[PDB]
Amino acid sequence: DLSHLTPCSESPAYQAKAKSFRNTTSDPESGQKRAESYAEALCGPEGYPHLVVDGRLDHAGDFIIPGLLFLYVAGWIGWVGRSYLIAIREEKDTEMKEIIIDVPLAINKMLFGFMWPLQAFGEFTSGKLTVKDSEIPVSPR
Amino acid sequence: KGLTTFLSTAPVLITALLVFTAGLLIEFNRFYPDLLFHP
Amino acid sequence: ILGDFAASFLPAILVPAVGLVMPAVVMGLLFLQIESEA
Amino acid sequence: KAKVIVDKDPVPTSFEKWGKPGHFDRTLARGPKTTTWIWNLHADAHDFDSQTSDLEDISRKIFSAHFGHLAVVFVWLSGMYFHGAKFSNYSAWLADPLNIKPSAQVVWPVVGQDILNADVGGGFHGIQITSGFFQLWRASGITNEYQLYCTAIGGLVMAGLMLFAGWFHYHKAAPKLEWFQNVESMMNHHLAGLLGLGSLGWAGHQIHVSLPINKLLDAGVAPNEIPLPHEFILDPAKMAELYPSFAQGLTPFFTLNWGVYSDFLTFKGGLNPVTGGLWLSDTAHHHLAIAVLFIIAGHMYRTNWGIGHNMKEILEGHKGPFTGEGHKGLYEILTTSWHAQLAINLALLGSLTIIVAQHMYAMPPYPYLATDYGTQLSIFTHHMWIGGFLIVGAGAHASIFMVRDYDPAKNVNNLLDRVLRHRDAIISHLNWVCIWLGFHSFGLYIHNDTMRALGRPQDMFSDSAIQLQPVFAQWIQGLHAAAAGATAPFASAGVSPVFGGEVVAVGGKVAMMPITLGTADFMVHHIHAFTIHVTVLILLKGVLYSRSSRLIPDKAELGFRFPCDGPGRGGTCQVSGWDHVFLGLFWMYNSLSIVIFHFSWKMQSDVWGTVLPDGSVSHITGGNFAQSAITINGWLRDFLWAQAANVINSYGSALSAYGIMFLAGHFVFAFSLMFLFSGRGYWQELIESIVWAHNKLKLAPAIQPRALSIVQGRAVGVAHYLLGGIVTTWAFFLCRILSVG
Amino acid sequence: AIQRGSKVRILRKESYWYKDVGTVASVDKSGILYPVIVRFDKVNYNGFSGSATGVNTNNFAEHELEEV
Amino acid sequence: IDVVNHGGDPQVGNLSTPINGSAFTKAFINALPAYRKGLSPNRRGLEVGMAHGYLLYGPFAVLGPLRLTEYGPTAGLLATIGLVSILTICLSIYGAVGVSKPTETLTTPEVPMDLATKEGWSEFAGGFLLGGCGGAFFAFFLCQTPHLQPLIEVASNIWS
Amino acid sequence: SHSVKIYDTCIGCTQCVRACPLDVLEMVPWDGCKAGQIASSPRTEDCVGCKRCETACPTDFLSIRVYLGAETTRSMGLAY
Amino acid sequence: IQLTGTMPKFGGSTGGLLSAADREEKYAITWTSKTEQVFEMPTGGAAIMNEGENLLYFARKEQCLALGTQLRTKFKPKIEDYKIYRIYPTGETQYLHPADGVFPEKVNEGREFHGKKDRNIGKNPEPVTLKFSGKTPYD
Ligand code: CLA
Ligand code: CLA
Ligand code: CLA
Ligand code: CLA
């Protein structure tokens, strides 16, 4: 239940720090906005917010939402890269547009890269995502 | 015509991509600063 | 400086023997061993 | 003999080659089959000799690339003047230069970097700059930011003009090969026309602009009631009310009555007590004297009219018994090889930049330069680093000359042939003097560590202990302190307060003190000589053994830049001339780091500090160079541990970017050792393991991933090593001196 | 079945393109040990350090191959 | 006029410079105890050891842990004796391994044939021992008997 | 002395012999190649081990292969 | 045998013969030229190929073939007629580089198979087979 971690509003070390939060942007009340926004976290004896990473809810915003957001964005980047790499193979001049990127193909790969997990599941169930161990270069033992 | 091929090279496009990504992150942390976690 | 332990004169003999005398002997003997022909 | 002949439109201006990388090399044009193509694209982009075999095309490329480099430098200079004009407190600094720090860069508040805007005075928040631009503009007579804005606009116009000239001299009217071979005209126009006319124009500016504006500034007039420099020329009455020898015209110049110009052309010598800089009358007189001397020297060489020298009969006549044939072949060497010219020019520019560093600290040329310790420390450190880099590049290009441009047919029994013939006697005696200097410069420190550790303070090499007083340098200091009035009878004071005299102090801080030399100075100067000698040993060993050795006799066919000849002959690793530059970069790092450490400790302990009202000087550290700069533990404790208390406690303050850069340089130094220690065959096998995992998911790249080559691995390691160490020392120096200075 | 232009997979373990598919440039009919010249899309490691080029063909035997 | 010539054979890796082999360095190197024509071993070694033992009572007598103490000259003598003994052990084991004929250079066209054998290098080592002990003791006696001898005050005021 | 071994996957391109700096290698006639020749290493006691022959070999894995073994005064390449 | 040759006009260097050349072995290269030109020694510096036949001594075989490569390539008269010998201090001379009289890159009858394996390099025995014996897996 994390009795050692108190909420930052009830913690009497966070309230001493929260007066002297510096402004980060040009907004004059940015320190006060940070102070009110970090009060819902858990603070230790230092008076600083802590993040609990075990997938629980009311602390899913620490890791689960940023983690799923990164997984979507990184899957977007990797899937668009893999799609471009596959698309530039079977047209007999691949190093030149590996080094000088074909922009009209890359734009069509990028803007249609939002549906990366559906295409990933389709290629996984279709077997066209993973190359079989026979048709692949392997170093000598 | 030969200029668009130079702009389609890997360093020019990676520089444009990194400047666009850094600008997007900087413009996000200006308007919405101090996001340690999702509330 | 001699110590309060028993036989305090033995550091005054063994330490120069193990630090100067027998390393000179071992390097001379090993030099003759590793540099002799046949 | 010297005429202008060009080819009209030799290279068309088209963008078709912009989209075809690797066009300059035949091997780079087949296409990127491996990732080594990408690194070879940048490694051989400027090597114009490997691109074309015709020296005329190489010289044309070099001449047109110089204009692009000058355009880049002019963009940089215009950016600095624009930052002074728009984002600086220069107008605030001119009012109160003793309590307002120079700042010329504000930091945008998007994250918590708004703390990096230091409170420097006058209601201005920004980064305290240490470049010395503010003192330079005060010595230039610049009073308002509009004069900086005009100079920034002029810098942009000049940068565009240099870009247009670079396009013009490669695509519209490109000079022939014999336009470059007549170095007689080139050197005459660089001595008289560039250095001579440039210093004459600056002497005229310092007569007409810098001297009246700076005399009104030192007299106590605020800069916004100080008249602009053009009514000093338009109205000579205001110019002649101060320094009243402008009442008479230019006729005493032409009747050789130069003595009446003595009020504004002085030879005072010392420092200005008001500002702490050199007298601007001394600088104007100096620029006039060297302008006349350079213009005279620019009439030495025969160009078109019979009078003059040809720089060959000078070389032909210089021959002795120990050499025989002499300098025959050297004119053809320096007029057919660009690399020999770069090796000479880069060595002299590096030693020149080191001279600039060693001179501007002792004779500060600018008002309130010695008062701001951060500016003085930064310009000394920066010019030492630039100078040492240029010297190592000179060793590099001498090595490139020896395998790519040296011809044994033109060099029989001359100086270069005989240097190659007794290179073993050169390198072995240099090796001996390096070993001797290492023992009798570093073993003194080791002995001092041992006797200070063993409780033997009387057995050390100290001032209280066995003394090692530098009697020759002290004798030379005594000669310079007594030089004014005895051997320089028309100097008011010495050239610098370093050699003797009194404490020159401005405000409450010391401008300069006498710098007494003791046992610690002797020992650290011998370490300086030792490290310089080892850098000379590695670079000169790379030069002399560039073509051949007892190990690899056919080493010129392998080239300048090759990794090794193989594991044979015991293993011929790092045999090339490039790898000696690679090791000499580490040794210039070591040398110049010890130089700037000696500077940053000696000046902080014995020169810099505050002046008590009683008259004594309380220094920054407290004069601990006499007793702690004789031990490595003293250098670790009283210099590295003690003075880095500012860079590590800088977090949450205005100098926290320096602590960040301190840690960042530590990271890059540690990151270098992955490339320096490991080898290519580990990483190629690791990339082979990664390629299969990419092949498993159809992620095979068309350009096959290779590990970095052995020379590129060494280059990446040494570049990261130098970057991480230099950034660390920059951060440590600047955060220390922005807290104690 | 080994003829010029047929795509074929390498069975030499030590080859760079072990279990990789390349085309046949020529097959020699004389009595030599490795008559099948096979050219590949990728390039070998071969070359000096820093060399951007490498070989992409080699001779192979009949038993060192399989037709796809 | 080439003052820097070869030794008569250009393809040998050496040069006959003024310092190397001109007129005054061929003599005085051929006339040192090593390379002198008429001397036997245990006489070359005697002369070399006497010179070495005499010179080595300079950085032990006034440069040591006891140099501020009246036992300082005696400790310097003992240290010189110990260094001469270590060097004699080094010479003895160098000979006992087996020596070749010494290197002939431009300065020394004739090297001592008597030092090309193990028996000659044993005589050289014994002569070095006796010479080193004699030279160290002679320098000790000369430095000790006036008990101040203000030439020792020079280079000890320097090595304070 | 090093062991320079030439294997039967040799195309007889003679690049190893021209790349060899100490005349270790030569060409002998051979019926098992299209070029009609194979490399041989008779005076392999002169091999320093530089592997310039292994650098110049155009086979997928090298038909000429240097094994660094016992070190002599010629394998070290010592002028002294 | 006995090496009839005159030495090129060289000023003498420090990279030449050391003490082991007169005690262990030294090497020689003799070559005939019909013109006088300038060459670079592996010793260091430049020397003069005088008219006629030349004899040079070196401390290594690699220095002699580094000279022979400079005699073959990079010269317009294209000198191939060079012979390399080994001289032991006993006096014996062994004729080394053009043993058949033809260069090794050109095939010649009368040369036998040295170091030739009638097996693929991948078809080599494992070291675990050859444990505790003098035989190494490349035999
Ligand atoms: C299409 C691009 C792509 C894809 C999807 C993959 C995917 C893979 N890589 Mg990666 N990688 C790539 C490019 C790519 N990589 C490049 C450019 C580099 C060189 C820096 C590497 C070097 C590399 C290493 C060293 C390792 C991986 C690993 C892996 C695996 C785990 C993911 C990971 O660790 O990411 C790590 C990703 C990086 C370190 C760099 C990725 C760079 C960007 C994000 C790639 C996408 C941008 C691309 C340049 C342009 C897209 C094309 C566009 C024009 C449409 C996974 C199979 C690991 C593995 O084997 O796990 C099984 C492994 O150890 N990769
Ligand atoms: C990486 C290159 C680099 C960088 C970024 C800088 C940057 C800096 N330099 Mg520097 N410099 C360098 C290399 C570098 N320099 C080299 C290679 C030299 C040797 C020529 C110098 C010599 C130099 C001097 C002498 C001074 C600077 C100063 C400056 C500072 C202000 C710049 C300015 O406007 O000064 C403007 C300064 C001047 C115009 C005076 C320079 C006039 C010199 C004496 C004439 C040189 C003529 C010619 C170009 C060289 C010919 C060489 C000859 C042997 C043939 C700044 C920190 C100044 C400084 O520290 O002020 C606080 C300063 O006075 N530098
Ligand atoms: C007047 C100055 C001068 C000039 C123009 C030359 C000219 C040249 N040099 Mg160089 N050289 C010099 C100074 C000079 N150099 C100095 C100062 C060094 C000492 C370090 C050397 C050492 C040297 C060697 C060792 C070699 C050359 C070679 C080259 C040639 C091609 C360069 C190329 O294409 O590489 C372009 C490569 C780069 C631009 C990469 C540089 C990467 C650096 C480390 C980064 C810059 C530092 C920066 C502040 C880091 C910021 C990090 C941040 C972005 C994150 C060309 C003849 C090469 C050659 O001729 O090959 C046969 C060669 O191998 N140079
Ligand atoms: C602390 C680190 C360190 C040390 C000890 C050395 C040591 C050496 N370097 Mg250096 N170097 C280093 C790091 C180091 N380097 C690294 C990082 C690189 C960069 C890549 C190299 C690469 C390098 C090159 C490229 C060269 C050297 C050379 C030298 C030698 C200079 C001659 C000298 O000073 O002799 C005196 C020795 C010392 C000062 C070391 C301290 C020894 C003390 C004073 C004496 C103590 C001995 C002790 C009493 C013995 C009795 C103990 C008993 C139990 C055995 C010396 C052996 C140069 C060389 O060999 O030519 C001369 C040279 O060419 N260095």
Author numbering:
A (entry chain F): 1 to 141
B (entry chain J): 2 to 40
C (entry chain I): 1 to 38
D (entry chain A): 11 to 751
E (entry chain E): 2 to 69
F (entry chain L): 4 to 163
G (entry chain C): 2 to 81
H (entry chain D): 3 to 141
Question: What did the published study say regarding this structure?
Answer:
Despite nearly 3 billion years of evolution, all oxygenic photosynthetic organisms use the same large pigment–protein complexes, known as photosystem I (PSI) and photosystem II (PSII), to convert solar energy to chemical energy. Both complexes use light to induce a charge separation event, then transport the high-energy electron, ultimately to be stored as a chemical bond. The first high-resolution structure of cyanobacterial PSI revealed a core antenna system comprised of 96 chlorophyll a (Chla) molecules, of which 6 are integral to the electron transport chain (ETC), while the remaining chlorophyll molecules function to harvest light and transfer excitation energy to the ETC. The PsaL subunit has been shown to be vital for these larger oligomeric complexes to form.
